[PDB]
Design a protein around this ligand. Structure first.
Ligand SMILES: Nc1nc2c(ncn2[C@@H]2O[C@H](COP(=O)(O)OP(=O)(O)O)[C@@H](O)[C@H]2O)c(=O)[nH]1
Ligand SMILES: [Mg+2]
Ligand SMILES: [Mg+2]
Ligand SMILES: [Mg+2]
Ligand SMILES: [Mg+2]
Ligand SMILES: [Mg+2]
Ligand SMILES: [Mg+2]
Ligand SMILES: [Mg+2]
Ligand SMILES: [Mg+2]
Ligand SMILES: [Mg+2]
Ligand SMILES: [Mg+2]
Ligand SMILES: [Mg+2]
Ligand SMILES: [Mg+2]
Ligand SMILES: [Mg+2]
Ligand SMILES: [Mg+2]
Ligand SMILES: [Mg+2]
Ligand SMILES: [Mg+2]
Ligand SMILES: [Mg+2]
Lengths: 136, 161, 122, 96, 401
RNA sequence: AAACUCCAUAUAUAUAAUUUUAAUUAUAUAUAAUUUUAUAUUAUUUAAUAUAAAGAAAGGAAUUAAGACAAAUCAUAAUGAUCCUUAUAAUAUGGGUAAUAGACGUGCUAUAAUAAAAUGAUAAUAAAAUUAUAUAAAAUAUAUUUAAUUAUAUUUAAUUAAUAAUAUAAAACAUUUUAAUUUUUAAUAUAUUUUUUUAUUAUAAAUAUGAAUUAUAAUCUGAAAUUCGAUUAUAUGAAA
């Protein structure tokens, strides 16, 4: 739960609280985890296995945090139900994540490993005065 | 302490005799620029090279060289430039031309003569015109001849002589 | 690292047989205009070392022609390390000069940098 | 979209139930955007300033000891007096 | 205001259609044969006369290539690219390929080589170069009642003619028919006399069937019959090929409109459906050595379909019909299509090409005179993007920069 | 005036646990040039040209003096004099500032093939700037049988921000099409130009340019769109 506070000012964003969890770190079975992810929708990113959500609905920060916690608990309860509602056959919708990725830029490319030349690298040049000095 | 290696030195020596290679054929580049309009150089380049390809196909010999020759032929070596002449008769004088100016004059004529050809694509028209000039037929030549004749009249109107 | 206009090109030049990779893909795929490719080659062409050096370019910012120019600039600097005696030659060729040509800003009264709105004497 | 529609709708409804957000499958004008809009009134009201600000009147209230002088007011009074003197004073206001 | 001799077309069209191949040097090059690839493994090779005849009819040699540069269209054999593909074709049990690669790498050329090989080895070739013609709506069509699909009886006729002419008649007339066939007659002669044309089982031939000339509404029926006949026969191999198959994959719905104003699906047509059936394990040819060789074109659109069909990307279910058609993928999976990546040119191959071009006299004076040969080759390799043949060719000839 | 100044540039140092990452960056602090050196060739120890070797070394912005033009502003604001004080001061409802003969500037869009239009999802390539009087993502629905595109509606995920959104930049480049143009089409044959060729038949001054003007239907903002706003659709298709 990340809280924000503007020191001298009275910003209306001081009420904003943001819960954020890795979904694998939550105590869930695999079927329930998938269901939880489905329920999350846009809130769950799939590249980083992270689910976060922020609330600005209430006056105070503490209230907002409490509300977020309650939501999380409700989500968990829903995930652990499994009675006449599995969501085994609804694949993970990753459209929002791909849209976000498109908006940003990528530097996925790397230097080819077979192009490397360790033999052409500069070898350690012999410094005799330094060697003499190093008596420790 | 610099410490240049032997192989590097040998490579440098080998390089030394070779002159630095030119980044552009200058006359061609000039032509492409003249063709070009709205900073759309790539399109002008495509047009020019396509035309040169066509020319080559029609008559199998270096197209760039042929174009240069055509320019040399067509470009009038001097122009009868008009003057006010201290508020009197507008006494014309033959004036020598820079290489670009010479080839610029030639190109405009070439373009005009191409524009009389049939096709929709200008590049095709241009290529046909270039082939005709290589073979040896244009009103551009006649215009050049006329210019030269007009320059010949006014022999000693040149100032420094 | 080379720059031109808004472009920035970090380039890894290595002694292996001369192949190119611009920004994690093939050279002809990245730079469609042959002019840009020719420009990129030019530092390797002033030397007789196109084919000698593998080049892994990584560009960011600006447009294609400017990016290509920044890559070229970077390559010349990279080459300079392999043999310092050629540095003068590269400089003479005009590859070691960082091309300063910077986009002029729109001034207030003018429409563009220099383009003023029409004048009217009467 | 090989995945079925009804299932997706059900999932969306469930998600809506979990969070507070409403579930409108038909896509009818509910009026949600009228109320949900944050009301901007206090900020608008606070435009010109804090009306309770110290004035010259108060600088007599707070510090009676110090005989202050409001210069602009004094000038205005002097101008009024001058106008009265030279027959250019304000005409007496009608009451009716 | 136009003469017969003058060039009125646009550039690409002009280069294709105005014979500037006329003024070109004759070149005594070796001949392309798969049986003697060991001799000419990495050398430029002109095609045989018979191959050329067949290949032109099929539609292998295309407009945007630089086939105008030489007396006739020419390729080189490649150990990594063409030879390997040929070996795979020979060896594999399925014999079912899709030629993938980057734009200009030489997919068509590979197709042309495959066709030439098939011609050499006594095989019939049903080539569909440019499916755009049948897929895009620029020729007549009609909903047949017997066959529940839209026939296209201008394109179909042309395709039949190509089949007839590309292939030699001795190989084609070795095939007796399985069934009898009635067709509507459509000769200038015997119109009133012969209202119908009848082909018998044993007496008649596949050549005769091909030569039949009907009204538009029976043309699709004729085509169907021919395909069936070819499937049945085990005497000769049938090479089916479709180049620019990328267009087919992407253009799922044609430009044709049915009675109600909405677009007709590609599989609701005769030609596209037939093609799909051939691709998949459905219209199975009786003989072995009977292949389908598809080819992508960089010209056409790219999307998730073809990668998903092959072993490339996992199947995202949420991507749209426009960017991913699953039916086509399913069809591709059904008929086990093993893809073939065309590799880019090696340095040696590039050098060999450049040498050939020099011999033919395509190189410019600035390239040849006053320049080291190895250095020139290296520059060419650099400018092509490390051996894209088309790009290299463009740099060589269409540069003038 | 120049210079110091700012932007931009090159280099160095510092900082950033390289998940707020773009280190190919950002920002503080320096150093750097109004560049230097040498050989020659003309004119008189120097100054212009050329050549060479040393360097990343090449711009833009702000600053526009004195006086003058009784130049502009009392409608940013203030003040002198003067005039109005049941009115020349103050509030509401509507109308006007958008009226239209001719005329005058600035622009925008055009008058088609060295130029216009369709398309282009392992989404070709930017920068600068905005988002608590908000920015509005994904996705569903309708226009629209597929879907995409474009436009609305439905509903708000994320972020008050190097973190999310506005926003997959566009020309480019590539295939396709393009009337004027019997410079094409389609029926036959034809064939080693087959997304094509040849033969013989039939294909007879504003368009498949432009987008003014108008008709109807919807949508958006707002309490309200008649005078007098902005979109979308189906028609209308001047002039040039
Ligand atoms: N493999 C090969 N390709 C060649 C040869 N000669 C020319 N080519 C090129 O091969 C290209 C065909 O590539 P293709 O994959 O059909 O391009 P696409 O249509 O964009 O996919 C042509 O543009 C030719 O220039 C050759 O000898 N071998
Ligand atoms: Mg192709
Ligand atoms: Mg990083
Ligand atoms: Mg100053
Ligand atoms: Mg002054
Ligand atoms: Mg004044
Ligand atoms: Mg005045
Ligand atoms: Mg006053
Ligand atoms: Mg006034
Ligand atoms: Mg006032
Ligand atoms: Mg009043
Ligand atoms: Mg006004
Ligand atoms: Mg136009
Ligand atoms: Mg794009
Ligand atoms: Mg959206
Ligand atoms: Mg962002
Ligand atoms: Mg129009
Ligand atoms: Mg008119």
């Amino acid at each position: 739960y990340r809280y924000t506070s503007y020191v001298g000012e009275e910003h209306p964003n001081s009420r904003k609280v943001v819960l954020s969890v890795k979904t694998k770190e939550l105590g869930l079975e695999e079927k329930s985890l998938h269901k939880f992810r489905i329920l999350a929708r846009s809130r769950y990113d799939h590249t980083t296995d992270i689910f976060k959500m922020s609330s600005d609905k209430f006056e105070h920060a503490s209230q907002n945090a409490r509300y977020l916690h309650d939501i999380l608990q409700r989500l968990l309860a829903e995930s652990k139900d499994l009675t006449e509602d599995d969501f085994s056959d609804v694949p993970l919708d990753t459209r929002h994540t791909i849209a976000k990725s498109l908006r940003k830029k990528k530097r996925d490319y790397e230097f080819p490993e077979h192009w490397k030349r360790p033999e052409d690298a500069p070898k350690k040049k012999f410094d005799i005065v330094d060697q003499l000095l190093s008596t420790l | 302490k610099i410490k240049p290696t032997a192989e590097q030195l040998a490579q440098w020596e080998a390089l030394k005799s070779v002159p630095i290679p030119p980044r552009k054929n200058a006359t061609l580049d000039h032509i492409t620029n003249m063709i070009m309009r709205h900073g759309k150089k790539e399109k002008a380049q495509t047009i020019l090279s396509r035309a040169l390809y066509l020319v080559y196909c029609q008559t199998r010999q270096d197209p760039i060289q042929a174009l240069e020759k055509s320019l040399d032929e067509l470009a009038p070596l001097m122009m009868t430039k008009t003057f006010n002449t201290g508020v009197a008769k507008a006494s014309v004088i033959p004036v020598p031309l820079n290489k670009r100016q010479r080839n610029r004059i030639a190109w405009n004529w070439i373009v005009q003569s191409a524009n009389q050809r049939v096709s929709s694509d200008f590049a095709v028209r241009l290529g046909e015109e270039l082939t005709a000039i290589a073979k040896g037929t244009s009103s551009a030549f006649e215009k050049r001849d006329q210019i030269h004749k007009t320059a010949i009249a006014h022999r000693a109107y040149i100032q420094l002589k | 690292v080379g720059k031109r206009k808004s472009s920035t090109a970090k380039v890894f030049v290595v002694r292996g047989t001369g192949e190119i990779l611009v920004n994690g893909r093939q050279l002809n795929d990245y730079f469609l205009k042959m002019k840009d490719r020719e420009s990129i080659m030019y530092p390797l062409q002033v030397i007789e070392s196109v084919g000698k050096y593998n080049i892994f370019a990584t560009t960011s910012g600006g447009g294609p022609t400017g990016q290509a120019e920044s890559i070229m600039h970077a390559i010349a600097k990279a080459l300079v390390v392999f043999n310092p005696l050629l540095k003068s030659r590269l400089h003479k060729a005009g590859v070691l000069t960082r091309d300063y040509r910077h986009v002029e800003r729109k001034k207030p009264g003018k429409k563009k940098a220099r383009k003023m709105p029409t004048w009217v004497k009467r | 979209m090989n995945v079925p529609k009804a299932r997706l709708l059900k999932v969306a409804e469930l998600s809506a139930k979990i969070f507070d957000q409403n579930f409108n499958p038909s896509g009818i004008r509910t009026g949600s955007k009228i109320l949900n809009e944050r009301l901007k009134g206090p900020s608008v009201a606070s435009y010109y300033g804090n009306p309770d600000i110290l004035k010259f009147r108060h600088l007599k209230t707070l510090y009676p000891d110090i005989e202050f002088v409001d210069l602009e007011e004094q000038y205005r009074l002097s101008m009024v007096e001058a106008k009265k003197r030279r027959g250019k004073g304000a005409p007496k206001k009608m009451k009716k | 205001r136009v003469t017969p001799g003058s060039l009125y077309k646009n550039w690409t069209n002009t280069t294709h259609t105005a014979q500037l191949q006329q003024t070109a040097v004759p070149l005594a090059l070796p001949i392309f044969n798969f049986d003697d690839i060991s001799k000419t493994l990495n050398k430029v090779v002109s095609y045989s006369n018979k191959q050329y005849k067949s290949l032109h009819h099929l539609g292998s040699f295309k407009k945007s290539q630089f086939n105008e540069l030489f007396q006739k269209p020419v390729c080189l054999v490649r150990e990594d690219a063409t030879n390997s593909f040929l070996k795979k074709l020979v060896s594999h049990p399925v014999k079912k390929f899709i030629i993938t690669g980057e734009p200009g790498v030489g997919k068509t050329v590979l197709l042309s080589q495959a066709h030439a090989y098939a011609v050499d080895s006594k095989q019939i070739i049903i080539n569909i170069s440019y499916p755009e013609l049948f897929l895009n709506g620029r020729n007549d069509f009609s909903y047949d009642d017997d066959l529940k699909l839209f026939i296209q009886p201008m394109y179909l006729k042309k395709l039949i003619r190509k089949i007839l002419k590309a292939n030699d008649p001795a190989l084609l007339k070795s095939i007796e028919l399985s069934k009898d066939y009635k067709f509507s007659n459509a000769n200038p002669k015997n119109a009133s006399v012969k209202p119908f044309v009848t082909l018998n089982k044993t007496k008649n031939t596949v050549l005769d069937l091909l030569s039949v000339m009907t009204h538009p509404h029976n043309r699709g029926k004729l085509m169907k019959a021919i395909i069936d006949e070819l499937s049945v026969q085990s005497k000769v191999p049938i090479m089916f090929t479709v180049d620019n198959f990328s267009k087919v994959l992407t253009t799922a719905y044609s430009a044709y409109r049915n009675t109600e104003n909405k677009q007709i699906y590609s599989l609701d047509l005769q030609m596209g459906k037939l093609m799909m059936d051939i691709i998949s394990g459905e219209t199975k040819f009786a003989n072995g050595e009977s292949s389908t060789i598809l080819a992508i074109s960089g010209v056409d659109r790219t999307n998730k379909t073809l990668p998903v069909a092959l072993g490339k990307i996992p199947v995202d279910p949420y991507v749209t019909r426009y960017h991913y058609e699953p039916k086509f993928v399913e069809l591709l999976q059904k008929g086990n299509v093993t893809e073939f990546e065309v590799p880019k040119l090696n340095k040696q191959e590039v050098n060999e090409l450049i040498d050939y071009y020099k011999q033919s006299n395509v190189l410019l004076d600035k390239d040849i005179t006053g320049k080291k040969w190895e250095n020139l080759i290296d520059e060419k390799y650099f400018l092509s993007g490390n051996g894209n043949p088309r790009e290299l060719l463009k740099s060589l000839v269409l540069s003038h920069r």
